[PDB]
Design a protein around this ligand. Sequence first.
Ligand SMILES: CCCCCCCCCCCC(=O)OP(=O)(O)OC[C@H]1O[C@@H](n2cnc3c(N)ncnc32)[C@H](O)[C@@H]1O
Length: 566
Amino acid sequence: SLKKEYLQCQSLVDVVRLRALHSPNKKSCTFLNKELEETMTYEQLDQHAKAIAATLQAEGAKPGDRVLLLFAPGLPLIQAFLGCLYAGCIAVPIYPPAQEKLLDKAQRIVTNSKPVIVLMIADHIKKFTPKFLKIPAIALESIELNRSSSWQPTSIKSNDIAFLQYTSGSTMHPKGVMVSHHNLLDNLNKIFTSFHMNDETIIFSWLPPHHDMGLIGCILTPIYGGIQAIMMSPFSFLQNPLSWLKHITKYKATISGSPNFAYDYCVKRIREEKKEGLDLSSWVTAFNGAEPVREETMEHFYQAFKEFGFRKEAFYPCYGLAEATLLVTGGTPGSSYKTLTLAKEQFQDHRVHFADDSPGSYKLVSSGNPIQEVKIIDPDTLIPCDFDQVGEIWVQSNSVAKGYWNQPEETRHAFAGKIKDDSAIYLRTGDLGFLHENELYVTGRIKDLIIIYGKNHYPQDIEFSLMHSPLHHVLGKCAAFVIQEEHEYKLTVMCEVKNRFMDDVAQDNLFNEIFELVYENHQLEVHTIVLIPLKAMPHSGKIRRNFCRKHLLDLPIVATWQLNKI
Ligand SMILES: CCCCCCCCCCCC(=O)OP(=O)(O)OC[C@H]1O[C@@H](n2cnc3c(N)ncnc32)[C@H](O)[C@@H]1O
């Protein structure tokens, strides 16, 4: 548990200063690049932060100013994040754009947040420019540690905004969640406590470090709690899922996790023979959150790795979202997570229709107990639902964020939930679910998810990615779309292939390359890939798309790949 002197700090900045004073040589973060290891102690993080803050100050940045960070995974960008905080500037972490000229998302973020400076690694100054989208750019490599002594401390307030975190999927009109210093520490504390962390905790992570779980859970929480973080890049996991498990083994990581898909992805790609040497016994919490959590995924993963020390006990479903900083519900670590079986037909008043383990039934996994206050509320009447009745998940706590940057009206729709009639104020999540036995079961979204993929232009942009990647040389036309399938949504990609007789080796190689490309460009996961003969698609990307959708439902297929199927 955190010592009192750390609990008493009013910002993450003061926490880091204090750990740098009291345990300067304690190792904090380790970043892995292939076989290479780079490490950073509290003393080093603190010194780099000061040097970085000093530079921002010398360049004319004032408290409250936004500073953009091209978040290449690594220690430098972590240093940059703290450096912003040390200067009282609002950090704005973004995924560095996958392709040099595909900058639209970054541009929208730049226009929204209006940063005065952007920080990035030397390799990116090259790729991207000095100015980046009209914003003056500074290479992190150029900030000399000598500058540290010139840092002038600011007077940070609890309610001051520490950083913006842009939601995962509002790409056409990005929402920058405003996370205050008080928000951040409240959620870090709930994470450290709820996950039963201690002095010996070791967190391993490959997750995108610029937002939600990969930032708040896997970097800021360890730094806050005085425990080790060990990390590699998402690209590394995507290219070789096995590395996740090899690193947990070598480092004896105790806590690591991911969205649900990643457990399936290990099952799908890791062959029996390659598992030799794995020892997952140290892994006591394997958290599963950020998307719908599936029993089948976890059962599959458990049987694929139980012979290598993985315990089903370790699986930890959890629920949260950026507007609530991060963690909202979660269970007790080491406990078996619960499931419920629902009948095929549900009730129109959204009450829950349970079934015996009937023949059209389906299972929902619990995302745990409310860590933040959770109320299930009717999104139309604003009247509380009964238990075992689906309504909107409303959240209330000190972790609830301050709004969406520079968006008063959009903020009004999400952050000003009032129950009829009476008094508290709630975040409205957009999410549907029900409480049962004080466990939250998330059931879906208010917004039709097909209609939301369509709004962010995902299928269209994914088709473009495929056509503009080197994968094009072996394909014909392609189509991406979301199909709703027995209580699940699946992102489906289908491609004409030049060689209808490529072997099983080529098939698998191609499936893997397509999954990796779509994650690289969109950090989205394809659930189903369909291969078909050249010319099989009609000579509109729209009528082209709807043909693929309609005839998959009722054609010539060369091969099908399904992420969650063994
Ligand atoms: C130390 C480890 C700590 C890490 C702690 C982990 C706990 C929090 C992880 C989630 C953070 C989040 O995904 O952020 P975002 O705003 O980008 O999207 C949020 C949205 O995604 C969905 N969603 C999240 N969970 C879900 C779940 N269980 N079931 C089904 N849907 C889930 C919702 O639709 C939701 O509104």
